[PDB]
Assembly symmetry: D3
Homo-oligomer: 136 residues x 6
């Protein structure tokens, strides 16, 4: 059903859209895949129309205004006319615990990720809520 | 662009769905309205299939697993086949700064609320991102 | 799998929207619920942009132009991008024979009602056409 | 709208009216929006109803029968596309009860061919801001 | 279900929409039918806004710019917000091999046809790709 | 006008999905983009459920049964519940005149390409039918 070739293609598509991020700390990308369709592609950045597109606060920390690639993928799916329920998620980085909570409640059956985010606990949050997790 | 009777009807519906929450600390409800349609009703609580519906810990603080009413309304809209963009939101309590971030990115033009959340900074966040706010 | 707590909330929402009616004889409200979503909310009244709000003529009777709550919810569903088929209907009052007829042809599986309308034949029409009926 | 498609939509209405099992009169209604026939309704008894007949022993129409416009309207609620800003092709001009709902549904125009016994329904349409054309 | 009476009606509708064609060689109509709805109706003709209405050149052959009734039906379904998957296709003439290829890949379960087109290979192609074919 | 880096991201996504193709002569990919969403991704190949996925005959030429990347993108949009009308197309190669015919009728307002396909007349067909063409 989901061959190693297409599964690689979706993950590489995630890596492409992470490069669109203006982020200095980490460039993150998220892809929502359902029935051979990419319904959303999210990357980390400040809100639409924000006074700056810089993700960092001058103290070295990420601005609390910036949205995570997963949040942007969820928000897009809410603005979309297609359901996120039953879809799969291709992330460049494992989602944070706050995001993993929403991803599970959204009805995403499986999360694919390539790299580990500094907070690993999101993986456990996903599996504890009945979401499959595969590192590739 | 809304008759006061209709405005009150939506707020009372938010208050009606907040009461189904199992939360002890505060019971919160949220209603997504677009073109005379309640596209989503969300209340605060633990995720679906979670081991319990109790929202607080042994020490009496809220469980980090519980989703907010606004989060649940946001997630429901991602499961929905209708767009949250251009809609209005009716909340029993003013959204937190974290939710307000997603609400503004979702394209919600106005947020109606009745009671104030401890962290009142969310109202400021919403207004700073071009979302009208009204207490009623 | 409707639970009593949540089922009462839908009926009380129907009662909330019935109060929006300008009708003097009887205030009626109808709620379309499918998959934990309120797809339509209808109440009795004159058509949109009619010369008057008043539902009754200067004689005792109801203006033949006014739409029943069930009619308004039905029409609303025709304007909706969601299907009424498989949904449940929460009504403050039992639907009239003319409405009951359309409700069954719409594919509504169950109608909930609280009060009995003067003509109680609609209950039979519903049950004869294979629509479950519960009073609450 | 080009005259030739206008006639094609009306002939479609006339084609679906014939599927009716009605003895008194066979009526067909077509919902058209952006080159698409979203609903095609005809007069008949409800689904699952014990009979196909559309009339009683007096030979009056059975109150259980749905009008062609009603079936078209109901189908639009069962579907996932909006009737709002659509046009309606009818073999016979809609009755006042159906015209009420047609107008509220946001149908902008009604095309009709024959006149139904009660002519008052056309007047209802125009009062509620719905364009009417006989063809 | 697809009874003889209604099946005839769908075929005659395809015959009605073929007469709209400005073609002189042959007038062809195709309609897409799913769950009692005619989602598309296509006839053969030049593209929208093409310099001429004439479907044939000066040599006697059809202009290569002319879209087949099946193509236009397919193209319409792409502009539509409804899915062609699982639908049935009523055609005045049996589709050509080129169209039959796309029709099968679209997920059309059955194609009905009345008259046979010059190149009858379309029928074979259609069956070889798992699409039912019935002449009426 | 869309940002240059996302424009490159779409083109590279077309290049990613062209690699999934099992074709030896040339690997082609097509991407449908509307309002920051990839509604379709198509590549050249044999139909679904075909005996093989080799797209060439012993004659070293291409099997007439194979679908072009743009055909697969078009068909996918018909199977979809979203509209192709007003979208932009990202292609690894310039479409053939047969596909360009359908692309213009679908309402695609712009075609982006990287490489030139041997028959260069497809660009002419697109431009003659009011479709913007840009090489990148
Ligand atoms: N296709 C898109 C478009 C936007 N965004 C997110 C990333 C930034 O957080 C914000 C940027 O908004 P914009 O590009 O409209 O200025 O929106 C996204 O994830 N995917
Ligand atoms: N219409 C609904 C249904 C559910 N929930 C939320 C409330 C709980 O936090 C979580 C669990 O609900 P359930 O018991 O239906 O699985 O889903 C919601 O916000 N709105
Ligand atoms: N959300 C709505 C809006 C309107 N109506 C119906 C009730 C009256 O019959 C009429 C009122 O029209 P308007 O809202 O334009 O004043 O429409 C309804 O049932 N539900
Ligand atoms: N495409 C359809 C199918 C059915 N009906 C209506 C006409 C009759 O009132 C009833 C017939 O019952 P059934 O759907 O079982 O054929 O349904 C309709 O208007 N349009
Ligand atoms: N409902 C429609 C509308 C249009 N067309 C096709 C017929 C012509 O080939 C092309 C051009 O039509 P027009 O000149 O009206 O834009 O559109 C079609 O098949 N079905
Ligand atoms: N997302 C997809 C899925 C399939 N195909 C096309 C490529 C081949 O021509 C055929 C392969 O089908 P499948 O992989 O289901 O066997 O369908 C495509 O272009 N894009
Ligand atoms: O789930 C996540 C977690 C982090 N990110 C992004 C957001 C931040 O700009 C970068 C930097 O991570 P930080 O939280 O600053 O360590 O990570 C994300 O996009 N999605
Ligand atoms: O914006 C908000 C903030 C809190 N809630 C719910 C979440 C918690 O269960 C109760 C109380 O939160 P607390 O942060 O514990 O005060 O509020 C909410 O639903 N929406
Ligand atoms: O099925 C029904 C029956 C009555 N109503 C409403 C419409 C009228 O304004 C009130 C008054 O009842 P009546 O007795 O029909 O005049 O009832 C309704 O909304 N739906
Ligand atoms: O507006 C109308 C009027 C009548 N019909 C059908 C209803 C009946 O079956 C036939 C005969 O109408 P009658 O009301 O019996 O004259 O017309 C209809 O479908 N739409
Ligand atoms: O599958 C098909 C095959 C032919 N046609 C139509 C299109 C052309 O205008 C006519 C003439 O075809 P010809 O090949 O010239 O016989 O056939 C079609 O619409 N769909
Ligand atoms: O416009 C085109 C032309 C060819 N392709 C595919 C078709 C074939 O599989 C390869 C090779 O083309 P050919 O026509 O075989 O040279 O290109 C395509 O997808 N789109
Ligand atoms: Zn996160
Ligand atoms: Zn919150
Ligand atoms: Zn009624
Ligand atoms: Zn009628
Ligand atoms: Zn053809
Ligand atoms: Zn091609």
């Amino acid at each position: 059903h989901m061959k190693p070739e297409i599964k690689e293609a979706y993950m590489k598509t995630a890596e492409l859209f992470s490069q669109v991020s203006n982020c200095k700390r980490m460039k993150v990308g998220a892809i929502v895949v359902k029935n051979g369709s990419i319904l959303a592609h999210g990357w980390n950045g400040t809100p639409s129309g924000f006074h700056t597109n810089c993700c960092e606060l001058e103290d070295g920390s990420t601005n609390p205004f910036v949205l995570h690639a997963e949040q942007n993928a969820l928000v897009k799916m809410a603005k979309s006319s297609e359901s996120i329920d039953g879809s799969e998620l291709f992330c460049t980085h494992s989602p944070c615990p706050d995001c993993s909570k929403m991803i599970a409640q959204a009805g995403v059956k499986k999360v694919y990720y390539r790299n580990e985010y500094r907070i690993t606990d999101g993986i456990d949050v996903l599996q504890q809520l009945g979401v499959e997790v595969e590192k590739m």
